[PDB]
Amino acid sequence: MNIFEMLRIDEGLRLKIYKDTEGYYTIGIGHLLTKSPSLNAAKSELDKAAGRNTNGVITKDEAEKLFNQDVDAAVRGILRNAKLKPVYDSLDAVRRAALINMVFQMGETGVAGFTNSLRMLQQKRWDEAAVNLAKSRWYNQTPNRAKRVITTFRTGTWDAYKNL
Ligand SMILES: [Cl-]
Ligand SMILES: [Cl-]
């Protein structure tokens, strides 16, 4: 398993525009197009992102390309963020993947705000961080996914993903 496979499981794959868990227009593998309530706005961001008149549909290869770019950008965002980088550099490879999943879903800002949990992850207090991560809107709004990521941080293995 790896980060790509992990997020492909948590985000799914859809070739026409859809609404994510928060009602925001998205496409592909979790590629947010816009938070605006407007379908035209979304269609227009989609065209600008694909470089062509898409009419709201993309192919598989384009979804995969937006995915590659989004993962690269999540990683680079962590490395440039003063509150995230030290955490990321302290973790082993499986747990790094769990932090990139969080940044992909919620944004660097969002994550950088879990101050207390980041601190515990840095200290390697696994169970504690798990409990703390759970007290969040993130966990109450998308509990199944949040559980998979939290178990990932707690155990340092891909067990929550094996089966899927
Ligand atoms: Cl883009
Ligand atoms: Cl969920």
Swiss-Prot record:
Induction: Expressed late in the viral replication. GO terms for cellular component: host cell cytoplasm. Transmembrane segments: none annotated. Changing residue 132 to I: 5-fold decrease in enzymatic activity. This is Endolysin. Its EC number is 3.2.1.17. It holds the Pfam family Phage_lysozyme. Belongs to the glycosyl hydrolase 24 family. It catalyses: Hydrolysis of (1->4)-beta-linkages between N-acetylmuramic acid and N-acetyl-D-glucosamine residues in a peptidoglycan and between N-acetyl-D-glucosamine residues in chitodextrins. It comes from the Viruses. It comes from Enterobacteria phage T4 (Bacteriophage T4). The gene is E. It is found in: Host cytoplasm. SUPFAM superfamilies: Lysozyme-like (SSF53955).
